[PDB]
Enzyme design. Structure first.
Site, PDB file in Angstrom:
ATOM      1  N   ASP A   1      11.091 -12.457 -41.007  1.00  0.00           N
ATOM      2  CA  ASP A   1      12.274 -13.036 -40.284  1.00  0.00           C
ATOM      3  C   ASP A   1      13.089 -13.393 -41.493  1.00  0.00           C
ATOM      4  O   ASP A   1      13.692 -14.677 -41.386  1.00  0.00           O
ATOM      5  CB  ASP A   1      11.593 -14.249 -39.458  1.00  0.00           C
ATOM      6  CG  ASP A   1      12.802 -14.728 -38.480  1.00  0.00           C
ATOM      7  OD1 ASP A   1      13.923 -14.049 -38.258  1.00  0.00           O
ATOM      8  OD2 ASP A   1      12.548 -15.847 -38.229  1.00  0.00           O
ATOM      9  N   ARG A  23      19.935 -18.005 -41.907  1.00  0.00           N
ATOM     10  CA  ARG A  23      19.514 -19.046 -41.449  1.00  0.00           C
ATOM     11  C   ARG A  23      18.191 -19.682 -41.829  1.00  0.00           C
ATOM     12  O   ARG A  23      17.797 -20.767 -41.614  1.00  0.00           O
ATOM     13  CB  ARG A  23      19.465 -19.058 -40.145  1.00  0.00           C
ATOM     14  CG  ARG A  23      18.458 -18.054 -39.596  1.00  0.00           C
ATOM     15  CD  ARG A  23      18.441 -17.787 -37.864  1.00  0.00           C
ATOM     16  NE  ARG A  23      17.380 -16.462 -37.676  1.00  0.00           N
ATOM     17  CZ  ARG A  23      17.732 -15.256 -37.745  1.00  0.00           C
ATOM     18  NH1 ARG A  23      19.114 -14.929 -37.802  1.00  0.00           N
ATOM     19  NH2 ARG A  23      16.997 -14.220 -37.538  1.00  0.00           N
ATOM     20  N   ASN A  24      16.999 -18.756 -42.372  1.00  0.00           N
ATOM     21  CA  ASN A  24      15.959 -19.130 -42.981  1.00  0.00           C
ATOM     22  C   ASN A  24      15.948 -19.242 -44.459  1.00  0.00           C
ATOM     23  O   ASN A  24      14.681 -19.317 -45.017  1.00  0.00           O
ATOM     24  CB  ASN A  24      14.923 -17.957 -42.442  1.00  0.00           C
ATOM     25  CG  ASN A  24      14.781 -17.986 -40.800  1.00  0.00           C
ATOM     26  OD1 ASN A  24      15.039 -19.160 -40.407  1.00  0.00           O
ATOM     27  ND2 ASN A  24      14.572 -16.875 -40.351  1.00  0.00           N
ATOM     28  N   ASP A  32      10.826 -20.343 -43.604  1.00  0.00           N
ATOM     29  CA  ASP A  32      10.617 -20.207 -42.217  1.00  0.00           C
ATOM     30  C   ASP A  32      10.111 -18.871 -41.958  1.00  0.00           C
ATOM     31  O   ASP A  32      10.571 -18.026 -41.426  1.00  0.00           O
ATOM     32  CB  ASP A  32      11.934 -20.229 -41.610  1.00  0.00           C
ATOM     33  CG  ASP A  32      12.341 -21.600 -41.669  1.00  0.00           C
ATOM     34  OD1 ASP A  32      11.744 -22.580 -41.496  1.00  0.00           O
ATOM     35  OD2 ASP A  32      13.602 -21.918 -41.642  1.00  0.00           O
TER      36      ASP A  32
END
Length: 288
Positions: free
Chosen positions: A158, A162-163, A176
């Site tokens: 992922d 954003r991670n 994340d």
């Protein structure tokens, strides 16, 4: 009442409980600022916290908790997500400070505080307005974290802006670890299988997010239509102001054949060369 939940550690898997035991934080050493929320989710919340070190010094941390616990599977998933970071040690990979297990209530996963939050929101802020060179530098830091992770045979699944988090020294920390369809490699969309080469595809999307200052990718293409769009050979277009050599790197990351994509080691070398030859303004240090 929700605050009297008791978790039976006997109900968690063997490898998981063994790992958690190695990183326990005693409750008297942690103060969770439950009225100072860093981020709210549907299943959990992240709060500011203070840990007391072995000499009495205060350490600012972020503490994640589950909002409502009804089953052991939820707890297992939450703890697995924290423990995954345990054995890695790299300046561009987020570390785990520990796990606090009070007699009642949710387990608390304690992470280092990241002053600047997630990379996506940071680059979208007009008051930050990062230079092109610093955006390239953040992409180099992410590639370095991923080169380390790949060396440990670890697949993120992922990877996206954003991670990735940013600390007070503007050090990017990949976090994340793994539906994020628009970041997935063509083969992952078709087979649901993930590899280091599919992480390379996602990395190319992350680089495009950096160079567009956090634009959403393929905004007009429905999620259910992405596989076909990609099979037709279409790709995200060169962002305005993005240096030509860096876009060539992004295109290489999205080769339809996984085996033809560069490795993260190769990406570190290439991006580092681009960074070193783009003579522009920059304010951050990216050579950890």
């Amino acid at each position: 009442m929700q605050n009297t939940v008791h978790i039976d550690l006997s109900a968690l898997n063997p490898e998981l409980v063994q790992a958690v035991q190695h990183v326990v934080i005693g409750p008297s050493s942690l103060i969770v600022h439950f009225n100072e929320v860093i981020g709210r989710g549907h299943f959990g919340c992240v709060y500011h916290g203070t840990l007391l070190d072995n000499d009495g010094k205060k350490i600012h941390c972020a503490v994640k908790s589950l909002n409502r616990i009804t089953d052991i599977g939820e707890v297992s998933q939450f703890l697995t997500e924290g423990i995954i970071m345990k054995d890695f040690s790299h300046p561009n990979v987020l570390s785990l400070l520990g796990i606090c297990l009070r007699s009642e209530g949710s387990p608390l996963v304690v992470l280092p505080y990241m002053k600047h939050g997630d990379l996506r929101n940071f680059i979208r802020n007009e008051t930050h307005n990062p230079t092109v060179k610093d955006l390239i530098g953040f992409g180099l830091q992410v590639a370095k974290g991923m080169k380390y992770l790949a060396s440990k045979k670890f697949v993120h699944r992922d990877l996206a802006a954003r991670n990735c988090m940013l600390d007070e020294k503007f050090t990017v920390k990949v976090a994340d670890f793994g539906l994020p369809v628009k970041w997935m490699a063509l083969e992952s969309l078709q087979t649901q299988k993930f590899t280091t080469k599919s992480d390379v595809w996602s990395f190319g999307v992350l680089l495009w997010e950096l160079m567009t200052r956090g634009a959403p990718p393929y905004p007009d293409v429905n999620t259910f239509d992405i596989t076909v769009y990609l099979l037709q050979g279409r790709r995200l277009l060169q962002p305005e102001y993005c240096p030509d050599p860096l876009y060539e790197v992004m295109l290489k990351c999205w080769h339809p054949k996984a085996e033809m994509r560069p490795s993260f080691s190769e990406l570190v070398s290439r991006i580092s060369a681009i960074f070193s030859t783009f003579i522009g303004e920059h304010h951050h240090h990216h050579h950890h």
